[PDB]
Amino acid sequence: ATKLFPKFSQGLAQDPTTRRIWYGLAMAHDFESHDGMTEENLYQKIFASHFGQLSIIFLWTSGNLFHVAWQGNFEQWVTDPVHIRPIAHAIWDPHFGQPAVEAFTRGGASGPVNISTSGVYQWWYTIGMRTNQDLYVGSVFLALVSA
Amino acid sequence: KVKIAVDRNPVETSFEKWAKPGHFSRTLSKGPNTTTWIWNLHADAHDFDSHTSDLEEISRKVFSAHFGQLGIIFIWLSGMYFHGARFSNYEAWLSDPTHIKPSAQVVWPIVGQEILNGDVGGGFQGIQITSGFFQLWRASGITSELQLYTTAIGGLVMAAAMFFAGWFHYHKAAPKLEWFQNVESMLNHHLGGLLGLGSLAWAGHQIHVSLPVNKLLDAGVDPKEIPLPHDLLLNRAIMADLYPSFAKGIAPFFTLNWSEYSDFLTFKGGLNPVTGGLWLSDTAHHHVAIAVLFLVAGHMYRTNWGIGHSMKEILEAHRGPFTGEGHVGLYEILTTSWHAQLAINLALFGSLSIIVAHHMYAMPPYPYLATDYGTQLSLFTHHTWIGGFCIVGAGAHAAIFMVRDYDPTNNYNNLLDRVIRHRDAIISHLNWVCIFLGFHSFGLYIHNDTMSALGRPQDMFSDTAIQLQPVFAQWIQNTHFLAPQLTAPNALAATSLTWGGDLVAVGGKVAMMPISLGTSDFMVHHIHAFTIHVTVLILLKGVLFARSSRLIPDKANLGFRFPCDGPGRGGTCQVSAWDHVFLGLFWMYNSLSIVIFHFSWKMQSDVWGTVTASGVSHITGGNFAQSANTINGWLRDFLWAQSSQVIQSYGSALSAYGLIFLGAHFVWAFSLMFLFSGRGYWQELIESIVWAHNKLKVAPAIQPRALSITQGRAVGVAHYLLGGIATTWSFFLARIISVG
Amino acid sequence: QAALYTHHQYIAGFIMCGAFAHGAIFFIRDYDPEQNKGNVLARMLDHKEALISHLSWVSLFLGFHTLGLYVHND
Amino acid sequence: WTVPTLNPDTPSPIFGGSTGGLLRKAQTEEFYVITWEAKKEQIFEMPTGGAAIMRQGPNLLKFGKKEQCLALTTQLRNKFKLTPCFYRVFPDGKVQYLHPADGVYPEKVNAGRVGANQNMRRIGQNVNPIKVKFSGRMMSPAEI
Amino acid sequence: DIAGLTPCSESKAYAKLEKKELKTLEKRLKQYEADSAPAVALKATMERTKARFANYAKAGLLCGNDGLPHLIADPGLALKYGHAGEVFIPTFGFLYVAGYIGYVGRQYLIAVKGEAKPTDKEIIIDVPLATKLAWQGAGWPLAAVQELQRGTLLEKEENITVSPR
Amino acid sequence: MKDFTTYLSTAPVIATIWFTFTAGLLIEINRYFPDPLVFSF
Amino acid sequence: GDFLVHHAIALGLHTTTLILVKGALDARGSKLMPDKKDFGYSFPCDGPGRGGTCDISAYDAFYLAVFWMLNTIG
Ligand code: CLA
Ligand code: CLA
Ligand code: CLA
Ligand code: CLA
Ligand code: CLA
Ligand code: CLA
Ligand code: CLA
Numbered sequence A: 001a002t003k004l005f006p007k008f009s010q011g012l013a014q015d016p017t018t019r020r021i022w023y024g025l026a027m028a029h030d031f032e033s034h035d036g037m038t039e040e041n042l043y044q045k046i047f048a049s050h051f052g053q054l055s056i057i058f059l060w061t062s063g064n065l066f067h068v069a070w071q072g073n074f075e076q077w078v079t080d081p082v083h084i085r086p087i088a089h090a091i092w093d094p095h096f097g098q099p100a101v102e103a104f105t106r107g108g109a110s111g112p113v114n115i116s117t118s119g120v121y122q123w124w125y126t127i128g129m130r131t132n133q134d135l136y137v138g139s140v141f142l143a144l145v146s147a
Numbered sequence B: 001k002v003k004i005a006v007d008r009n010p011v012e013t014s015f016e017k018w019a020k021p022g023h024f025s026r027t028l029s030k031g032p033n034t035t036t037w038i039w040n041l042h043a044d045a046h047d048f049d050s051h052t053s054d055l056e057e058i059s060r061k062v063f064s065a066h067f068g069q070l071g072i073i074f075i076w077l078s079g080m081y082f083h084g085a086r087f088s089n090y091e092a093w094l095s096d097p098t099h100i101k102p103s104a105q106v107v108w109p110i111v112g113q114e115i116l117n118g119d120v121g122g123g124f125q126g127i128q129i130t131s132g133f134f135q136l137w138r139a140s141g142i143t144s145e146l147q148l149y150t151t152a153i154g155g156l157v158m159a160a161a162m163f164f165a166g167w168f169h170y171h172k173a174a175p176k177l178e179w180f181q182n183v184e185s186m187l188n189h190h191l192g193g194l195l196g197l198g199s200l201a202w203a204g205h206q207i208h209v210s211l212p213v214n215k216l217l218d219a220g221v222d223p224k225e226i227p228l229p230h231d232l233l234l235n236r237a238i239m240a241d242l243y244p245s246f247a248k249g250i251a252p253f254f255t256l257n258w259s260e261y262s263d264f265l266t267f268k269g270g271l272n273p274v275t276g277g278l279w280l281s282d283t284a285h286h287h288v289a290i291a292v293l294f295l296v297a298g299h300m301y302r303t304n305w306g307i308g309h310s311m312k313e314i315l316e317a318h319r320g321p322f323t324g325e326g327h328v329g330l331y332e333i334l335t336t337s338w339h340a341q342l343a344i345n346l347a348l349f350g351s352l353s354i355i356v357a358h359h360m361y362a363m364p365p366y367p368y369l370a371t372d373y374g375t376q377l378s379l380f381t382h383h384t385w386i387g388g389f390c391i392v393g394a395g396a397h398a399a400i401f402m403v404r405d406y407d408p409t410n411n412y413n414n415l416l417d418r419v420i421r422h423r424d425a426i427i428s429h430l431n432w433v434c435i436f437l438g439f440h441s442f443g444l445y446i447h448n449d450t451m452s453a454l455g456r457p458q459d460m461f462s463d464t465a466i467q468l469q470p471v472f473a474q475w476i477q478n479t480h481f482l483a484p485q486l487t488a489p490n491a492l493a494a495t496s497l498t499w500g501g502d503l504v505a506v507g508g509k510v511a512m513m514p515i516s517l518g519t520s521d522f523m524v525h526h527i528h529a530f531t532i533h534v535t536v537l538i539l540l541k542g543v544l545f546a547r548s549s550r551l552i553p554d555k556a557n558l559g560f561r562f563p564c565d566g567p568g569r570g571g572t573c574q575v576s577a578w579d580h581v582f583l584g585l586f587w588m589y590n591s592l593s594i595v596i597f598h599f600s601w602k603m604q605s606d607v608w609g610t611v612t613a614s615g616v617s618h619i620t621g622g623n624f625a626q627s628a629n630t631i632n633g634w635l636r637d638f639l640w641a642q643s644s645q646v647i648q649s650y651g652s653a654l655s656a657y658g659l660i661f662l663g664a665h666f667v668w669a670f671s672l673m674f675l676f677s678g679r680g681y682w683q684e685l686i687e688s689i690v691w692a693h694n695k696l697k698v699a700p701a702i703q704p705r706a707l708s709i710t711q712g713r714a715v716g717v718a719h720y721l722l723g724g725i726a727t728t729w730s731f732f733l734a735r736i737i738s739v740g
Numbered sequence C: 001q002a003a004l005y006t007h008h009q010y011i012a013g014f015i016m017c018g019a020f021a022h023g024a025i026f027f028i029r030d031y032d033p034e035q036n037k038g039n040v041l042a043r044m045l046d047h048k049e050a051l052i053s054h055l056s057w058v059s060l061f062l063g064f065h066t067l068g069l070y071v072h073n074d
Numbered sequence D: 001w002t003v004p005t006l007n008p009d010t011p012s013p014i015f016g017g018s019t020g021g022l023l024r025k026a027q028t029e030e031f032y033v034i035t036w037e038a039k040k041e042q043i044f045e046m047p048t049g050g051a052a053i054m055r056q057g058p059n060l061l062k063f064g065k066k067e068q069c070l071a072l073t074t075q076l077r078n079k080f081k082l083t084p085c086f087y088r089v090f091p092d093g094k095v096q097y098l099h100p101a102d103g104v105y106p107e108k109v110n111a112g113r114v115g116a117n118q119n120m121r122r123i124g125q126n127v128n129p130i131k132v133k134f135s136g137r138m139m140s141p142a143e144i
Numbered sequence E: 001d002i003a004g005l006t007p008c009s010e011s012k013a014y015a016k017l018e019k020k021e022l023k024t025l026e027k028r029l030k031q032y033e034a035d036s037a038p039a040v041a042l043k044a045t046m047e048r049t050k051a052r053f054a055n056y057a058k059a060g061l062l063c064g065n066d067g068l069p070h071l072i073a074d075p076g077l078a079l080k081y082g083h084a085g086e087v088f089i090p091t092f093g094f095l096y097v098a099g100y101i102g103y104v105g106r107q108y109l110i111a112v113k114g115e116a117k118p119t120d121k122e123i124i125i126d127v128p129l130a131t132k133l134a135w136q137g138a139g140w141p142l143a144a145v146q147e148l149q150r151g152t153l154l155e156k157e158e159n160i161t162v163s164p165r
Numbered sequence F: 001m002k003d004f005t006t007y008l009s010t011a012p013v014i015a016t017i018w019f020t021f022t023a024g025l026l027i028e029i030n031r032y033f034p035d036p037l038v039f040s041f
Numbered sequence G: 001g002d003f004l005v006h007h008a009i010a011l012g013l014h015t016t017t018l019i020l021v022k023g024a025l026d027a028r029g030s031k032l033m034p035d036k037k038d039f040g041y042s043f044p045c046d047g048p049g050r051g052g053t054c055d056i057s058a059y060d061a062f063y064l065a066v067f068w069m070l071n072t073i074g
């Protein structure tokens, strides 16, 4: 047989083993050794890939802003930060039992939240955020930029 | 016609070949040119099939080597008795066995090691022994250090005798082949002579020395006032004072009136309540019956007179419908090959060792053994490990027989042939059962861990939640506890206290208490079964796929020990039977580690402890039934809780363990370089350093070469086992010597 | 503090290992000797045994003395 | 010497039936068939496991891969001094001849062979892999 | 003083540690008799211990806040404040003996390369020659600098270098 | 007797003898001069 | 304590540099194999010949270096 996956290497998409699956996952970003790869094509693929990476980065940061702004307590943390702990995000796991959720509910929240050991709260308090609304605005902006 | 057949002066005695290293083989002889040749000199020293190709010479070699091994054992025993005699506190221990701890080693006052001399009690200083020679010596009747010294001298003399015997039988009177190939005479003489007459002689020694001396010692008189044993041999009336049957002499024996020997040949069951060991009358009766049994068994085979069996006839008569020709052709296999014999004998020998360990904790035979916790733990652990190693050796030499000495022309339709001919079914089903046990036996622990961490402890497998009861073992436990009333009408008690019943306490501590079996026991037992089956899988796969396979059709021609067959056909690293032995070693380590952990924690939680006359307060408070279903339970309650003594031993008389702990870790982590990496990298690095020597004209004229693949693997597993086992040794001894 | 510092340290480790890995890939795939005849890049390939030898030496020295002092204190 | 075909009515050696015989590489792709003529009955070893008895006269077997036929060929040749020949059979009735495929086993040189895959330079006269870069696929410099 | 510490003579922590060790040692000593070899060894330990403390106080050692001696590894600093006997003299001693061992070995290697079978005399030591060379190099550094200044210490570029570049 | 001396001239025997010598020498020095840390002398 | 640990860290850096630099510079070829450049970066081995050559590629040198990176950052 001569299966489709993967199309970048013909000799790889030839053998009737399960080596083709693992190797097709492994040689995907080895642009220099695909079939029919010139040099211009190499540079162009690298360029577009860089754009992909930038999109993922900005989308991720928007995610952090969104979850902090929605499920966190950044509005209450700025009044007294030698006190009430940072909040990263909230949990909804159907596998929990009663003392589990009774335990995880900490930091002043109303459900299973877990503490934010990331330093985003101090960063955003220093640079000049004060409320949730500003964080939401930042998240929307960064999602737009990622798009 | 079985007879003596000996040749005269085959090999002369001169130092000539000691100055010619590697004289034994044709390949090694020409002298070194690389550093591979040194390791080849040491690797093939005992490979007696790789010097010549004749049976007789190999047999003579292995015979004299056996003599050498016996000699070194005698030197070892002599050392032990000597150190007991001169550098110990044995007499102070006999005066008071409790509160005086056994010590038999004294260190020299140098850089500061003199803090290792502990306060063992009795006005003595030294290192506490757990080998338990003191209880053995009290069981034999030894009361003075002079007798120990005499035994030491006797041991040394026997050692010299053994080395001379070896020299004699290789150089002056060396037997022929057909002396060796008379297996039936060897069976008769071993079964009768060695086992039987040894049992009978030791029964004699017990009846005439060990029974009365221990009767007086347990009666309360101090050991010096007790009469010397030759007064017990010579004077009948003292024995008549102790056991009145001796006043009638040996008249009851020869007229079949044996019922009058019920004073020193008994059948009472449990233990000596004042001592903690077995009743010595039972022990003497036991060896008498053993000797009669073996002396009867030793007249089974035909040697020179018409009576008796032939092995070939017995083997060739057993063949059924499902197995073709049956056993026809196993006698020629088992009289012309040494590796087959080594395989069978190592197998049964190691399994025998493990059974020794189990019976030895269950029914403590020596006086004042059960209340010396360290001795119990050390003896069980030691015999466990020796059994494991021997069984893996059985695997290895069965593989070597498969590679070298197997000839299919003499072996056509046969049990061995048919096993080879459906190895695929065998290994496939063994693989299946390994995976089944894996998922269930370990997933139970993962599930209990998850449920116990998610807030719901009601959905985990335990004694109070969903229950898994070992109903079979509990039923067998009750069967044997009830045995003295229906199915053993003449015993007064059960054969041990682990089957149930009352408690035996010697000096405040617990000798043995009944053991209960719950859900944690169920799960750990299936863990044991799982690891045992995996090791069987690896070793049996090595044996069956030693000659050929679907991957390599000519694996026999590459030999027993070879690294690969290139990177081709995908890659064929580790296809020899030798590497199957290698991985088997790793899994043996795993399984036995689990076994001895199970024993240690179960005993510290449910058996040992002090009888404070307020019930029983165990050492760890009895937390096994609640904690041995979570991996967190083991990691916290066992490894993290019980390491407080081995990590804080600095400054006390116990710091050697807390200092050999870390070294054991170091060697364990040092093995990983040899295991993970490969020799090409080291070859290139060694080449660059060779350049750095070529610059300064210090080029070694022998050539530096990296280790071969097989040697790198072997060194890796050596360091791995050494580090792991040394860690466990240090941990166990520090813990139980500290709190036990 | 703990998580931030630990995070950036491990990230730095992986990045540096990647740097040397792509050095090796450069030598295998993209190096050309005739274009690089006599620059510093060929000089580094000329005396590499000295480099590997002296790195081996310092590694040995630090290993022996560090482990020795720790074991002695123990 | 011309290229011979086989006669598929030759008997087979006596053997009990192993596990390790033909799987379904034979049903869809190929299986190999070996043939030799013995002189006296004798016990040989299968390259799967077990022992078999060759017959007095022509024989015939069938195997899965090629290393099995080569293993049995080496064993029958260096130990018993016979002349085996093994074929390749496709699962529709197609028979291909191979080993020797020259009449003479490929150690004694037979005039009339054409050498292939045979470079004519010293091993250290290969080009750098920068000068074969950016071709149709992955190429070793010593493949050009 | 030298990086914010004090010498052990007036160091309070020094005497406290000394008292603590003597205390544990006498505690071990209490339960035996007055003629027993246990007590003999224990009193020997007391003597060695107190002598060790006096010897460390006498040599002008420097103790931190734990009361333990600290070594100073700096030529100018140790030579200026009287501490040459803790790193400086030890390093010159070790370099002497280590270069001695290396030089003796190297001379053996050149001595045996000139034979008919260099490997046998490597695996089986020529004991007369080895003892002879074991004496002949007690002054190695002079012979070393002579071999350096004559250019025989270093092989030229007939060493085997990796192929290719 | 010549071959016995040559056997004594092998590598591991001389390693054993020489390391016994060096070990014993250091041990004796550490007995007669107990606990050396600095040189000052 | 800081003295001892800083030396341990220097040991880590010099060792990891040794493995990586050796892998990089011996990527064109070694004496165990003088045409390593014909195989590319990550190839398995060269089989049992010449004493067997496991882990000879530059990929495997970096492979060994990763362990040291993890240790040193540890
Ligand atoms: C009653 C006679 C007798 C006894 C006691 C033994 C005992 C033994 N034989 Mg044995 N053997 C016998 C008859 C006997 N054999 C016969 C008739 C043959 C020829 C068919 C052989 C052929 C034979 C072989 C080929 C080998 C043995 C080995 C052994 C030893 C096994 C090691 C062990 O666990 O011993 C436990 C240790 C002891 C019991 C210590 C006691 C030892 C003393 C010396 C008692 C030995 C009695 C001696 C055999 C009687 C003759 C003495 C001599 C001066 C005439 C053991 C000492 C093996 C061995 O170890 O070789 C050295 C071995 O390789 N035997
Ligand atoms: C195998 C071990 C063994 C040995 C060595 C002995 C030995 C002995 N038992 Mg004994 N016993 C044993 C097992 C053993 N038993 C067992 C298993 C039981 C339980 C059934 C008993 C039950 C038992 C009882 C109930 C009694 C003994 C007694 C005795 C002693 C006297 C035996 C007797 O009356 O004459 C037996 C005669 C002989 C053995 C003949 C000996 C022949 C000599 C040695 C030959 C020497 C000849 C030679 C040329 C001399 C050299 C001369 C010149 C060089 C100087 C004797 C020391 C009796 C005793 O003394 O009680 C304390 C006694 O009452 N035993
Ligand atoms: C009765 C026991 C017994 C006997 C007689 C033999 C005999 C033999 N075995 Mg064998 N074996 C045994 C038990 C035994 N084995 C066990 C229990 C195992 C499992 C571990 C093995 C595993 C095994 C393998 C895997 C192989 C053999 C091989 C051999 C043969 C060559 C041995 C050789 O040259 O060693 C030379 C001697 C040594 C290598 C000594 C080194 C042993 C280690 C490194 C030392 C142990 C460290 C020590 C405990 C602690 C160190 C102290 C200190 C230095 C720190 C020989 C016929 C080899 C063979 O090919 O057979 C033909 C082979 O490949 N055996
Ligand atoms: C802890 C590490 C570890 C683990 C888990 C295993 C696991 C295994 N080894 Mg193994 N091995 C290891 C270390 C380990 N090995 C090391 C270090 C060595 C070197 C000596 C070996 C050498 C070795 C050999 C030589 C052999 C094995 C074999 C086996 C298998 C035994 C069958 C079994 O229990 O599978 C059951 C699987 C488990 C118990 C793993 C846990 C599974 C969990 C509990 C449940 C899985 C469900 C999962 C959660 C669902 C996924 C959800 C997700 C997709 C979202 C198994 C795959 C043997 C084998 O394959 O034959 C049977 C075999 O021949 N190994
Ligand atoms: C700037 C970043 C960067 C870039 C652009 C590249 C780019 C490249 N590298 Mg490279 N590399 C980098 C960083 C980078 N690397 C770093 C930091 C390291 C050190 C670790 C390496 C180490 C490295 C090696 C050793 C090799 C490359 C190779 C390559 C080339 C092919 C990549 C490929 O096919 O991988 C395909 C990618 C994959 C198959 C992904 C595998 C997934 C990995 C193992 C992570 C999995 C962890 C998992 C997600 C954890 C989940 C946890 C779970 C509980 C949820 C390509 C030119 C290869 C090359 O040139 O071939 C000759 C090659 O051999 N690189
Ligand atoms: C415990 C773990 C451990 C240890 C101690 C080492 C030690 C070492 N590794 Mg490493 N390594 C490890 C794990 C370890 N590694 C792992 C898991 C891997 C992954 C595969 C590697 C991969 C690796 C590579 C790839 C390289 C090293 C290198 C080195 C050397 C670095 C130089 C040095 O520090 O000299 C200090 C040396 C020691 C501390 C060795 C101990 C010597 C003892 C103390 C002397 C013997 C004491 C006594 C006499 C023994 C008596 C017993 C008797 C029976 C003989 C050194 C030998 C490099 C190297 O060799 O560079 C030169 C190198 O290239 N290693
Ligand atoms: C490993 C490098 C190293 C380092 C970091 C130091 C560090 C130090 N040395 Mg020093 N030293 C070293 C090696 C080193 N030494 C060696 C190998 C020698 C033997 C040649 C000396 C000989 C030496 C003397 C004789 C003196 C010092 C002094 C000093 C201290 C201040 C001067 C300084 O830092 O100069 C920078 C050092 C270097 C860049 C390293 C090269 C080593 C040079 C030769 C030492 C320089 C001495 C300096 C010029 C004296 C300045 C006087 C000061 C009052 C301003 C400082 C603690 C002085 C002191 O006691 O301070 C209180 C002092 O008098 N050293």
Ligand SMILES: CC1=C(/C=C/C(C)=C/C=C/C(C)=C/C=C/C=C(C)/C=C/C=C(C)/C=C/C2=C(C)CCCC2(C)C)C(C)(C)CCC1
Pocket: C019, C020, C022, C023, C024, C026, G024
């Ligand atoms: C003292 C000080 C200073 C100075 C500083 C400095 C000057 C530093 C430097 C530093 C440095 C100086 C660093 C460096 C580093 C380096 C590195 C990190 C490297 C790396 C490399 C690599 C990685 C390589 C790679 C490669 C290869 C391997 C091959 C070829 C290609 C390439 C190149 C890519 C100042 C005054 C400013 C201030 C004060 C303080």
Ligand code: SF4
Pocket: B563, B564, B565, B566, B567, B571, B572, B573, B574, B709, G044, G045, G046, G047, G048, G052, G053, G054, G055
């Ligand atoms: S040389 Fe090493 S890696 Fe290569 S096939 Fe053999 S064992 Fe495997």
